[PDB]
Amino acid sequence: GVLKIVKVYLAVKRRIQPGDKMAGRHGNKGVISKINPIEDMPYDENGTPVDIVLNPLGVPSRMNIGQILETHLGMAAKGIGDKINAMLKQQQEVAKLREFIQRAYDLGADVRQKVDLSTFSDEEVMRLAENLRKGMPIATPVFDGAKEAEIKELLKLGDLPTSGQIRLYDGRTGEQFERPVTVGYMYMLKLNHLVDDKMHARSTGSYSLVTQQPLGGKAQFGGQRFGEMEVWALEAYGAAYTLQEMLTVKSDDVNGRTKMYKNIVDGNHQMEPGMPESFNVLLKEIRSLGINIELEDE
Amino acid sequence: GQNMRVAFMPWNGYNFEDSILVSERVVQEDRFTTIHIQELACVSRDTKL
Amino acid sequence: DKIRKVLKIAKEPISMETPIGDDEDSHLGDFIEDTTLELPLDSATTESLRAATHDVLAGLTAREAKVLRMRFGIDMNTDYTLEEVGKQFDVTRERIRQIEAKALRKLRHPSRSEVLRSFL
Amino acid sequence: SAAVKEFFGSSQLSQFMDQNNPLSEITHKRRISALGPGGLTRERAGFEVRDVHPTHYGRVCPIETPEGPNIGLINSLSVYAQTNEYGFLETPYRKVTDGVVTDEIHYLSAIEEGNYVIAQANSNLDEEGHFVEDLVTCRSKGESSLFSRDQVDYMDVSTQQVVSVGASLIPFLEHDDANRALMGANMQRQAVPTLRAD
Amino acid sequence: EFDAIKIALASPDMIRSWSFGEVKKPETINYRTFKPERDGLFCARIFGPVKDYECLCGKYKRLKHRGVICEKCGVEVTQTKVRRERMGHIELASPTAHIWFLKSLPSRIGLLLDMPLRDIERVLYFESYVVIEGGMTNLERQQILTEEQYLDALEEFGDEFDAKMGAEAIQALLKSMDLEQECEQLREELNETNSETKRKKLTKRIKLLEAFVQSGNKPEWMILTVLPVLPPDLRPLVPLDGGRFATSDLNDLYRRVINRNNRLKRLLDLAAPDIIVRNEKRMLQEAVDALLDNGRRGRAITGSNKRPLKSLADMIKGKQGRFRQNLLGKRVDYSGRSVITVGPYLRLHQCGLPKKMALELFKPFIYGKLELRGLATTIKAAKKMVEREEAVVWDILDEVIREHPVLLNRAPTLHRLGIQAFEPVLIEGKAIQLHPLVCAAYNADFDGDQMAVHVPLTLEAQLEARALMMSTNNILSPANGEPIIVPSQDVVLGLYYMTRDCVNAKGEGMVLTGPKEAERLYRSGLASLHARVKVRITEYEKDANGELVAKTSLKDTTVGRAILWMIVPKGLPYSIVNQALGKKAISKMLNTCYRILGLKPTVIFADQIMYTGFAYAARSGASVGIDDMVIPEKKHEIISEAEAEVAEIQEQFQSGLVTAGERYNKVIDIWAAANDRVSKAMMDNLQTETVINRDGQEEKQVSFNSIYMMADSGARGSAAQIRQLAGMRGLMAKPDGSIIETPITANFREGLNVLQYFISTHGARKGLADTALKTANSGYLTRRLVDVAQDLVVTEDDCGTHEGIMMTPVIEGGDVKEPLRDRVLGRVTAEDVLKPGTADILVPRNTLLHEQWCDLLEENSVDAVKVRSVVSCDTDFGVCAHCYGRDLARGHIINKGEAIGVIAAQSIGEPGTQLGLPRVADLFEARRPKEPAILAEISGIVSFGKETKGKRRLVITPVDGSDPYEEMIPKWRQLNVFEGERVERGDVISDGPEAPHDILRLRGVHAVTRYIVNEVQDVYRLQGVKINDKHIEVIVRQMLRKATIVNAGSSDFLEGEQVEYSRVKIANRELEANGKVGATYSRDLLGITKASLATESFISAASFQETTRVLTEAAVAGKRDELRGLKENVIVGRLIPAGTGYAYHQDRMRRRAA
Amino acid sequence: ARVTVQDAVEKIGNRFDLVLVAARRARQMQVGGKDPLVPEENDKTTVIALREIEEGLINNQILDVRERQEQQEQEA
DNA sequence: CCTCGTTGCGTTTGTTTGCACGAACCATATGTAAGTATTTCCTTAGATAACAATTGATTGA
DNA sequence: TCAATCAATTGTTATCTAAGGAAATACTTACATATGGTTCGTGCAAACAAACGCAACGAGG
Ligand SMILES: [Mg+2]
Ligand SMILES: [Zn+2]
Ligand SMILES: [Zn+2]
Predict the structure, then answer these.
(1) Outcome of altering residue 63 to S (chain D)?
(2) Is E898 left (phi over 0), alpha (psi -120 to 50) or beta?
(3) Does the domain made of E626-766 have the CATH classification 3.30.420.40?
């Protein structure tokens, strides 16, 4: 039967916004709430703002300390890169870059990894340094990771404090935050829970076939299920007109909802509730068994 | 993902329960931007009319 | 062409209680809308169009307005024919035709049907 | 043709491939499920089948599993786990002679694992195969204890072998509560590729 | 319009009266031109037209011809909506039993005829004959033959013999019986018989016969000779895209019935052999059963796929049936949903609504404003503007929502506060912003949660949202009276940080002129936020009414507390800010503000507290680093010492002194001791170790460690988590229960090795699975509780009863578990409360004990106070406001109309996930314990009789009264009392848990309610939850809703009839007008499931639990459901009789009783 | 402007009759049959009705008295 | 006031629509098979608890 | 020496709330005849459609 199919491929670009879910690798979820101007962010003595601000109250209750460790080491890693970055902005030498990078790969404790820069040609060392100017990647195996003392030593190799905390200033006021704060680099992920795909609204639309009620969610432009527990909440309040309109004119009364739409159009916020169609369906279904169910005092 | 310079501090309730406060530089650098190709088909059939 | 018709012949209808991949509470009948329903905007537009036709036909001479209300079934029974309108106006059929043409021309005037063309 | 297509297209154990990630793809491909035609049902599985077992060690990940209606029923294969000819999961171990940890790898199945005492991957060696400590921590039958250097038959091939691929991408996992590590693995299965991979 | 709903059996004449024609063919659609077929399941002549006012054939396509029936096709011309109302019928060629009335268990057909269901099924499936008044000579009426016996008696008897087969025989039996004579004979049997099993059988049979003969029902109607057919639009055959069709299973079941009925008609036309006709009748019976229920017949018939067809009964019952999926809850227009962000700038009464969401949700309002303000000539033009989002559409949208509240709802609505109304503020985004102070009420976090927004449309709905549901009206819990908008974590941290004092702080000692001077000093950097300074401060006290006397004094405080003092309202003491201000302090301060000043100052104070706490937590720079988790230096020593003890005890076990289990227990004990020592050392090292000096040698002050300050202020974390971070994380128990003898010694600051992490996952997954499988049964309990108490409303102002309950402090083991203040706060005294010395009337009889009276009672040390309770109220159909009390959501007495049963159910149920819970389920189900207590049935002297295998017969003899009551007590039950003693009523004879039934029967209603409340409150208190006893007493009153007539006397009741207690109360009230009463009852106690299922309304009882049983009972009995309930009115879409509709309902009664 | 209804609830009580009387009065204003009794502050008729209740200018007794007198004067 | 341009009405000529009517071409419904031929499968898994009814054994009279 | 009362077995009913995911596919009677409905082109009268001619009217001169 189908005569001809045309498929069009669209390419969207979703940037970022409040409502998008971010996450680290340590079970630390989070929804973006505000996107801040660069001059409102906390900044350190060098005037470099922090990209993200995370609540510290999230960490203690849920014992995911790895993130904190990941932050410290993260800072340390970036620190090494920063140093390399400087040594690349001024054309220092091959020897100095080779020496610093080699020193950065040794780092104390007896690690099974050996990197000898002597076999790296000058051209290769420069390529390595250029790949390390954004930061020094670090491997921390699952249960054989980096000990805290090694993290402090790497923090010392760069000129960062070994406490893992620096003093930050308020961009709004320029005043120094008391009680130095923990800043570092954390691997944040953008999860596939974009608020673009989750926001949904509806005034009126298509209605279900047997029961004259709205349809499912956001693919049929359907409404929100005001289930039984929501009805209980309305009952516990005194909200009887809210409840009645919710289950008669907003859902099921076929004649009621058109009258309500018209009445709202001319600014008469009153309803003629009527009998929901689903109760009529139930009456016809019980009567379709050999049971006579009728309304008294017609 | 992306490795981001994060600070751990309260900052005015904008990260209250698990909310996250993000700088505008993060948006400017388009480092959490994604591409979302999608199909849309128009099928012409043989109807009775 | 008969081959295509025989192949098009509808297969067994799908049960409306068919679970969707989730298989929990999504059934096929949950995705099917009532196609023979009047959207509230359409019904309100119909009411407003009735009112607009009333308020526009009001601004017509008595016999022209009556002729136009008769020729179309405007708030009355089945539409009348020109011969019937003559049977009621006791005038020639072509006279009623000319009258209705002139009435439609007058209704075509700007500042007299801008809302009516907004109804298009 | 109908039977084959019914299996490959419309069956519980054949599903749309999670493709929003390399890790999501790889962790879907090596996914174990107790459901489907011939297994349990999420509605009436029972807690005992969902629970972690001491035989899961090195064969089925303890944390990479979905939290929700089917938890402990969608386990994921560990990094080094294999399958017998008969279909039972086996995990590698390095053979231990009198006191030397040899580099020959034997894949032990669950029922064979009990009959030997297996040293931990977090055990030391004095540059020649001998354990530094005379008492080493092992697990013989479900439980673990201390055993003499000249008592162990096997040692863990690596300290990564208890986790799945996704769980083994979490730095400082040992510092994270098991609930939050479960959450972290599940979440990093859902990361969207950004414009430039850093 | 309609007052009640009547349900009864359906006669063939009635089913034909509903019908608009006979469905004669199984055809549906013509497969080429898909119009309906002439006499099929989709028929235009029978069921109506398929297009509006358009005749099927095509000779009539105008509204003008409405009201005529065509001639070329005979199709009426009308609306298509009539397709949803017109029913057909099928004339069965063989009677078929209704499956519900044959397979009800008990079978109504079987019980009515006194025939076992086995025999009836044997006759129905043409396996055996049944005599039908077949002569009173050799074979009795109810006797059943077989093929052998029937053939034997055939030649032996030609006439005066009637033995038929199948459902026609059952119908003949049901029609030949006369109900009155059978009832008379069974009454004679009942009155001249002594056996409880046969007595009960006779009572059940009589009740069926009487409820049948009283109603218009005729037994033969239980055999279906005419089958109704559902309207086609309720079993649609619609087209799917691509030439496919979606059809309902009812079409297939109906087609099977029609096919088999037509084949039976054909066979009877051909005079086919009895075997073929019998097989066809069996098939027709099976088809009708499948259509009605598709169960109760061994095997359900499946469709084209291998899935059973959904039957007529399956579309009403269950979690997915009409009642629960479409009548009690619904999908709703004018609704949206989105992710929630925080938006900490908001005031408590407003929420951030996305502009696009608001534009879609308020579309009709925008169209109306566009038309009214002249910006659009017609509605279509306004739609085009709103689609184009022209600049003025946003101005109209701002005008529309200026004071239009919207309801925000989070997915699991565990209690009332799960839906709250807010004023929308339009935000340029896509995520709803939620005030931080309502998250606790919503149980909402900002890690990906979503919320649904609903628009109230009518003026009444808008005013209800403003005056009932507004977030500003809901600041106290409705379960307890405690505030529910308390600041949670960041606010608590900020206030705690700003209020606590240092020892040597910049600006210490200087004297200030007021809070403004303190703020200027701090903000200018000259003084530290918490520097011990003196400051002139002006408190306001409201000793008497209205007047706020001012008291100025030099307080010794900090700079931070002085700064915070500007937030506080007037009539509050300064001492509230002269502490460290943890989470508990802030909640108590908000409660004090509410109880002194009122609601508006409290809302303003809460907003200001949130703003200040956020600001100062930001300024604090509180962070978390690895150094902030300090490990005790003694941890290594402690673990070494514990390991040495373990080795020593292991050797002792190896010495043959102690069994392995005892050694394991000793190891567990020593490891627990070591864990406690490590935790204590950690807390000492982390709480107050910070040492500094103030112009001197040194001092000591509480630590400013960030983790410690988070735990101590109550912001996040607890000693358990802190010890898991720094000290060892204790011993792990494998999900079986055994504690792993080797405990995890590593904390999380240091890593866990692989073995320890495996052990930890053992319990992590157990917890996750348990919480995933817990909320299901808690939700089921809440559903049962709501269903039992849905029809309870505060209907009166004062019943006038004097009976109450004595509230005393709960003491167990010499300590108070809950004082009297928290038990008697907000309850009306039942009887005058005197001082212990009887000196004078301390508090009048019917005063509502607010916190002032409670303070007086505390001062004068009154141990027991008799207060009114819902369970002892005298109101019929409801309870007065003076027996309920305080309406814990507000401070004032409960209003008239409040649905207190729903509130009680939700308050009891929403904490059920914190729970254990099965104990509460057992208590509310009133389950009898497995090995109960043998209590003393009567008072008297106890003695023993026969003691043989028929276990010991114990006899208790009153002083004067008769003693025929003897108990058959087992010997393996240890008697508490000796053989030759005397026992009081309701005493304990054996030992065991006391069944609630026996407590009610022997001790009383107050005894059973006290038992239930105390036990369930013990569960909740153990788990840390706080619930008022009003709610548990409401549930208990609903459990005590029935009574059995021990002696009818001169009342119109039977003996064993379990009547509704209110009916018998009104009867005993009325019969006091006469002299004769003779009406005495025993109160029953049913579980919530049993009490709610046995209720007057058949709709409310069919709506939640088994629907087939309830509907069949209500059909055979002919029940008439006057709505008079929340569920009943919710189903029929009317104003519930609870809240703002209560008045309306009362008015209806005003017009009905005339 | 409107944040809380505690003075209107005080003046009428029962927290439910306030809703009904305010709805009656707000509908009176909304339909072109009545005018506000308090200075309109850009409020909606619901808030205007609540503000009239707080002032004491509107009660269920005042409303029915005014309805009755309007009926009586309709005779003219 | 007379006279000339605009409109009401009927007339003549010309065109599309609504019914009814064969005609023919395919769609449907129905009938007729004469080596013999003779009782069906197939499906499905690891719940759990509670409550009555029914059926069967034990015991009081 | 029968039957009222325990006791084990059978059958019925119950198990949180929302949002996403789209469903699939074995399982073949044929040739002839009567009839009848549907599609299609036609004719006839009815119903519109164009364009004038005449007379009355009412504004202009
Ligand atoms: Mg969450
Ligand atoms: Zn017709
Ligand atoms: Zn009372």
Answers:
(1) Resistant to antibiotics salinamide A and B
(2) beta
(3) no
